[PDB]
Amino acid sequence: MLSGLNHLTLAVSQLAPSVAFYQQLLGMTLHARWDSGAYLSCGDLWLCLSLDPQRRVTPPEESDYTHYAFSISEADFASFAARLEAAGVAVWKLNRSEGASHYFLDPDGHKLELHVGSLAQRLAACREQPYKGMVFF
Amino acid sequence: MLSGLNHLTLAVSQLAPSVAFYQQLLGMTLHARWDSGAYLSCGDLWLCLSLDPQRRVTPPEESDYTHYAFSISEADFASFAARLEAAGVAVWKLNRSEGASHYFLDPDGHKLELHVGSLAQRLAACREQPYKGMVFF
Ligand SMILES: CC(=O)Nc1ccc(C)c(Cl)c1
Ligand SMILES: [Mn+2]
Ligand SMILES: [Mn+2]
């Protein structure tokens, strides 16, 4: 059957600024870069950046809620978020509707998130503060 | 420091067909559902389906190359691809790279992939046959 995300591929309009964002600003590990892409890792995540002439720099009001959240510890969360803010990284959401999260945009407007906590922890939190109509299986 | 992918959230136009697709067709585990979304798991992947009236059912020619690949073993790949074909799931690309890949669309046009092979396998193949402009770190 299916087991896990094998990789996340993000289309990017300008390869070098996107590599710099994920590697320098977010601290991911850069493994390889070529004329039309790059491979990075973030823990066990394989991230591919793919140069795509069709990728548009998209304001967050023009895209849907699809987004990619990266894990960070409770001890590191606030200083990492504050560093992104001080660096001028654009945001897209403020209301913490799914726990301790910071919502920010990549250079092309991909919707990203820093989040503290696992699915199990979110389910436990939701039992006390459930989403409207929530059922647990 | 970021330690991995925390969750993938897909905006969906209709929650019921999206739950059927990810849970019943793709075999992911449904943990919770509420009026406007659902939480599933696929191995270590935490998947959130978020009901979003801004989600358009998007033909593949009208979206960029951003896509989400799920891991499957080589032994299971062909029968899973056949299952998707029997279900009438559209393909958006043919495989021309190393490692088996099946490129298929979700009900809203999210670009998905089944892939066999890790980042390490891809890097080993690339070292033997580097892409144009390829540099390793
Ligand atoms: C022309 C040029 O400067 N290319 C270049 C710069 C930095 C990196 C990391 C790479 Cl692979 C290539
Ligand atoms: Mn999220
Ligand atoms: Mn892929």
Side-chain angles (χ1 to χ4, degrees):
Chain A
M1 86 284 213
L2 304 188
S3 180
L5 199 75
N6 185 271
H7 58 271
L8 172 60
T9 296
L10 302 181
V12 303
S13 66
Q14 302 191 48
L15 182 62
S18 295
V19 172
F21 185 89
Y22 288 94
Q23 183 273 294
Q24 296 173 5
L25 188 69
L26 297 189
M28 303 193 177
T29 300
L30 177 64
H31 294 277
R33 172 170 161 176
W34 67 101
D35 284 353
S36 297
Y39 294 143
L40 301 96
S41 65
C42 179
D44 60 296
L45 168 69
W46 175 9
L47 173 66
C48 173
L49 302 180
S50 182
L51 181 61
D52 187 353
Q54 296 194 331
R55 177 64 202 190
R56 307 306 173 211
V57 181
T58 305
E61 306 86 358
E62 280 294 316
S63 64
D64 59 51
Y65 198 62
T66 299
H67 70 267
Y68 322 115
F70 305 110
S71 297
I72 190 165
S73 73
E74 173 149 341
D76 296 343
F77 170 77
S79 65
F80 201 113
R83 182 174 58 78
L84 299 178
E85 285 282 287
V89 176
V91 300
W92 63 275
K93 177 182 159 76
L94 283 172
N95 164 248
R96 297 206 179 169
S97 50
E98 55 180 354
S101 293
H102 179 72
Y103 297 99
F104 66 106
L105 298 168
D106 100 336
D108 283 304
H110 288 289
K111 282 174 174 165
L112 310 179
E113 172 188 350
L114 308 175
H115 180 75
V116 183
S118 66
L119 172 58
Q121 289 172 309
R122 186 88 299 254
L123 291 166
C126 285
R127 281 186 188 279
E128 321 281 7
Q129 299 193 352
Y131 316 141
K132 186 77 197 274
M134 194 163 195
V135 169
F136 300 81
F137 301 97
Chain B
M1 175 192 20
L2 306 180
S3 57
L5 192 79
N6 189 262
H7 59 268
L8 169 63
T9 295
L10 301 181
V12 303
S13 64
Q14 298 180 238
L15 187 56
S18 296
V19 171
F21 185 89
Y22 288 100
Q23 180 195 26
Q24 297 297 326
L25 190 63
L26 272 58
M28 305 191 184
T29 299
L30 179 63
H31 292 276
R33 179 175 174 163
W34 58 101
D35 287 358
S36 60
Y39 285 152
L40 300 95
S41 66
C42 179
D44 276 311
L45 177 66
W46 168 10
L47 176 64
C48 175
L49 305 179
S50 181
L51 181 61
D52 187 357
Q54 188 170 5
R55 176 65 199 186
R56 188 167 72 94
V57 180
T58 301
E61 300 90 350
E62 305 181 22
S63 60
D64 61 49
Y65 190 59
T66 300
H67 69 267
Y68 321 116
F70 306 109
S71 292
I72 188 165
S73 73
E74 195 187 354
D76 294 341
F77 176 89
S79 58
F80 208 106
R83 177 186 182 80
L84 297 172
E85 287 296 334
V89 176
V91 165
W92 60 274
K93 178 182 174 69
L94 298 187
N95 185 25
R96 299 181 174 83
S97 46
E98 71 81 31
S101 289
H102 184 79
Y103 293 98
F104 65 108
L105 297 171
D106 104 332
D108 284 303
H110 288 289
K111 282 172 174 164
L112 308 179
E113 176 187 352
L114 309 179
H115 181 62
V116 183
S118 63
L119 172 56
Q121 177 179 300
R122 177 58 58 89
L123 290 170
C126 289
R127 289 198 192 77
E128 303 238 293
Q129 191 168 109
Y131 302 156
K132 175 182 145 274
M134 190 156 216
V135 177
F136 297 89
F137 306 90

